Amino acid sequence: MKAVATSPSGRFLKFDIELGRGAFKTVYKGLDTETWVEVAWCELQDRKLTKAEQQRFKEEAEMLKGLQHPNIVRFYDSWESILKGKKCIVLVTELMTSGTLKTYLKRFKVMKPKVLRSWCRQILKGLQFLHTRTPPIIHRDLKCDNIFITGPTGSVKIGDLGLATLMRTSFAKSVIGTPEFMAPEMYEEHYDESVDVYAFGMCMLEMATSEYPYSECQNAAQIYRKVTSGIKPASFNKVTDPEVKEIIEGCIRQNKSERLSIRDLLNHAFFAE
Ligand SMILES: [Cl-]
């Protein structure tokens, strides 16, 4: 008999089918044996966490189960197990197979202005939802590659919330952090939800320009110099819509105190609906 893995409740079953593999995370196809709907069985492990960091990892993953929002990926279950002699986190999520904003831009080359306005508003809705939880949830790792879509003319859903919690730790932040999207205060000890606004601005810039922000830079230190010197990414001057350009500028300001808030963005006339 083959050993088949299950959730502690027995509801979710793991397939021996690997869907994706990255740092700290391997995604397998799974099955809800009660509804007979296929899911994503995500196994997370950061072997360099301390005991207190792993425990916080376990607790933050378990809080994802209670999240229910149209623009957040659905996280059905979570528990702590062991993998290769050390603890790991399993995270069962809805199966996203329709691509991301990244694969969307690579497929359709450019994003039409009405699509950008609609999907950017939905990202702000999801971030507003995360920021108003108890305790508040900071994404810390928002990028076009982890904003999933339900279809070419569907909705967006913020994902990879389990992996994103590892940005709070040293080793993982240097491995999975995308410096082009990270606000400058993320290289300090303490920061707040304004880093999600900064990353949102870079997502909006990438959507508005169909290119990688700060692609002209070679490493994080180069980007950090430009950001802290008030030097915008070169793609910023390719934004054709002056209203979109004004919103991006307000989101990627180097000083957090001058940065626009989520409430300011949703109350902006561009996102009025
Ligand atoms: Cl995740």
Curated annotation (Swiss-Prot):
Compartmental location: Cytoplasm
Domain of life: Eukaryota
Residues binding ATP, per UniProt: 93-96, 143
Post-translation changes: Autophosphorylated at Ser-170 and Ser-174, promoting its activity. Ubiquitinated by the BCR(KLHL2) complex, leading to its degradation. Ubiquitinated by the BCR(KLHL3) complex, leading to its degradation.
Modified sites of kind Phosphoserine: 170, 174
Annotated catalytic residues: 160 (proton acceptor)
Tissues expressing the protein: Expressed in brain, lung, kidney, liver and pancreas, and in fetal tissues including placenta, fetal brain, lung and kidney. Very low levels of expression were also detected in fetal heart, thymus, liver and spleen. Isoform 1 is brain-specific. Isoform 3 is kidney-specific.
Domain called Protein kinase: residue spans: 13-271
Reported impact of residue 166 to S: In PRS; likely pathogenic; results in decreased SLC12A5/KCC2 phosphorylation
Entry comment, domain topic: Disordered regions undergo liquid-liquid phase separation (LLPS) for the formation of a cytoplasmic membraneless compartment that concentrates WNK1 with its substrates, OXSR1/OSR1 and STK39/SPAK.
Family: Belongs to the protein kinase superfamily. Ser/Thr protein kinase family. WNK subfamily.
Function statement: Serine/threonine-protein kinase component of the WNK3-SPAK/OSR1 kinase cascade, which plays an important role in the regulation of electrolyte homeostasis and regulatory volume increase in response to hyperosmotic stress. WNK3 mediates regulatory volume increase in response to hyperosmotic stress by acting as a molecular crowding sensor, which senses cell shrinkage and mediates formation of a membraneless compartment by undergoing liquid-liquid phase separation.
Subunit comment: Interacts with WNK1 and WNK4.
Pathology noted in the entry: Prieto syndrome: An X-linked recessive disorder characterized by impaired intellectual development, developmental delay, autism spectrum disorder, variable epilepsy, craniofacial dysmorphism, and structural brain abnormalities including polymicrogyria and cerebral atrophy.
UniProt-recorded name of the protein: Serine/threonine-protein kinase WNK3
Organism: Homo sapiens (Human)
Recorded name of the encoding gene: WNK3
